[PDB]
Amino acid sequence: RDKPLVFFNRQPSDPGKVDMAAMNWNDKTYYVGFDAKFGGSIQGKMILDFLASSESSVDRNGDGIIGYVLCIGDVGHNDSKVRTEGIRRALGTWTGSSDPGQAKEGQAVVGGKSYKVVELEGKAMTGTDGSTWNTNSATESMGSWVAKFADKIDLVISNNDGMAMGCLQASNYPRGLPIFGYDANADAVESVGKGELTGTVSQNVDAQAVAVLQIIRNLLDGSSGEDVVANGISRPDAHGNKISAPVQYWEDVKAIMADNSEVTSANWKEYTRGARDAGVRQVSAPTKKVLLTVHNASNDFLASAYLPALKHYAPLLNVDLTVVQGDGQNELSCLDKFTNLDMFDAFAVNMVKTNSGADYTDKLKY
Template sequence: GMSIFNAWSKDQKVPTFGYDANSDAVAAIADGFTGTVSQHPDVQAYLTLRLLRNALDGADINTGIADADDAGNKIDSKDYKYNADERSYYALNLAVTSENYKDNLDATTTYPDASKQLDKDKHPEKKVWLNTYNSGDNFLGSTYVPLLKKYAPLLNLDVEYIAGDGQTESNITNRLGNPDEFDAFAFNMVKTDNGSAYTQLLK
């Protein structure tokens, strides 16, 4: 959407829609970009680390999501869904238009109701190894990872971030030489059927 908007449709006044809500796309709405879709990265990033925190604490899976945690963190039901059959949480898409774009100008703003600091005595700091599959991915690099870096200290997680080359799993797995040093792992595979390339390192 942004490529065609900048190259042609902006000057031609042709309505143009995007499919991601990176900060540049949202800011362009003021210049005539018709709108875009936010993947709710603030919820995506929070859920990634929240589920790790819950597992490390031995807490109920919905703690800090459907049910407020002891700091008051919670996600509104309109902003996510849980699919029990797939055992997966999903952040729900949000239309960003001229009516609400000012509220979404900074894609790295954390979710307001899930931005409270956890007590370190109740939730001791844990070490996490987390990778993203491609260092060149704009969404991951400019939005998702910056959000993770904001949430991690709030959830008392010391995260080591690794970015792959988008081509091979080995570019990522070769950098996990000391799994015993970590309490938890979050793997973002290059190919979704290559889970064993990661799990075999944890034996």
């Protein structure tokens, strides 16, 4: 068939190269995701810009060193390693390894002056039960870090929000000690608003949600070429709607990729629980039917963040959204519910196996 087909959240590929056979299903096929590989770089940037804007006061003991402690989530997990590498490279403490204990003396500018940077300690947070990204171990480690390093700690850095909020639960957390996380969880963004957590990082789920719906509307409304991926996304559409977060377009892979955004005192209100893009308003237009797929009904992120975003923005773009969800293990749990395709004007597919692009395009021929 020749209807719009927007893959999202999981990019068609070998589980490593993009499945360009799927992407070229037709000239109305796209992918929507986010700039994942650069996530660590953005956390690092946030931390560097914070220090750059700081006075000499952030150097608590005034030894000309910016000392930090690092919460590692999982030494074998890609997201942990990317975020560790991201902040270590940014601070110049990177040696080629994301492992704990593997850092060198670094450098960073504070108030126009060069400071040494030392990773006082980086530690994997693991529970007694073996569970990783462990919040309780973070709380305990933070408490011990205060006792051991005391005024040497100038900031705390964490692979995620969960562990960072764990650190803030330490009964002896030094008052006003800067600390940074990652994920932009609700409680984390709230903390940023209260001036406790210093920063975190968002993948902009809302931007991704709107982009899926906007690409579809642009296509069904008769747009072609640059308009399809720009209107309502990186510039206002005919109605004035426009995604607020920055978004990229990767042409060779037909991918609309939201930036990773840092979340600080400067913009936390835009990322709090239930916050929605004020740049996307109700449109007066004919209703269009969209069948949307979810690879796992039990996935917390898709269930708690992505789907609710989709359901909020869809009626504003006059999209009648029908959602079907799989179990998370077999591709059939989605394909079976991927029927009645003659009833819909467009399709958004989130498959469990990235290489299963051909299974869906086959059903689009009947």
